[PDB]
Design a protein around this ligand. Structure first.
Ligand SMILES: [Ca+2]
Ligand SMILES: [Ca+2]
Ligand SMILES: [Ca+2]
Ligand SMILES: [Ca+2]
Lengths: 17, 145
């Protein structure tokens, strides 16, 4: 669950950028 | 290996967990993130998640620890099972496909209001087969790129 969240947050920020 | 732009992007991701900006992710900050992803982990579950990344056992995650995990796991090829959990975070109705509305829902919950045009662009970028939606194989590529 935590690593899934980490991958998602990475995708999220790079989607913003 | 791990590039300097990957380092920068992993740090940006870390800082989104580390919301008070003190350099360490606590169970409390981890909770905030998990709830915005539609989950509700208990304190024990939050502490056990910390155990996964916290290498020196002090009860929090610093950036070098966060980076160690991100860098190591990206070299792994056995994270299908975790990506499947990540998929289910987006696929709220469980139909096997992430829709624009499902994508925008998760994005806005993390702190990003997108237009209907911007969500469509993201789906369009990830959508390989052309059903205007994201299945698992396409989702892997969007978590793996
Ligand atoms: Ca903190
Ligand atoms: Ca630590
Ligand atoms: Ca769905
Ligand atoms: Ca598709």
């Amino acid at each position: 669950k935590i690593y899934a969240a980490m991958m998602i947050m990475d995708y999220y920020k790079q989607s913003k950028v | 290996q791990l590039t300097e732009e990957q380092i920068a992007e992993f740090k940006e991701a870390f800082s989104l967990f580390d919301k008070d900006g003190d350099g360490t992710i606590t169970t409390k900050e981890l909770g905030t993130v998990m709830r915005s992803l539609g989950q509700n982990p208990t304190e024990a579950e939050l502490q056990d998640m910390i155990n996964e990344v916290d290498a020196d056992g002090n009860g929090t995650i610093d950036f070098p620890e966060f980076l160690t995990m991100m860098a190591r796991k990206m070299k792994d090829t056995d994270s299908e099972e975790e990506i499947r959990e990540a998929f289910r975070v987006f696929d709220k109705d469980g139909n096997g496909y992430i829709s624009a509305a499902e994508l925008r829902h998760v994005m806005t919950n993390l702190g990003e209001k997108l237009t209907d045009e911007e969500v469509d662009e993201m789906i369009r970028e990830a959508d390989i087969d052309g059903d205007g939606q994201v299945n698992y194989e396409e989702f892997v590529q969007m978590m793996t790129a």
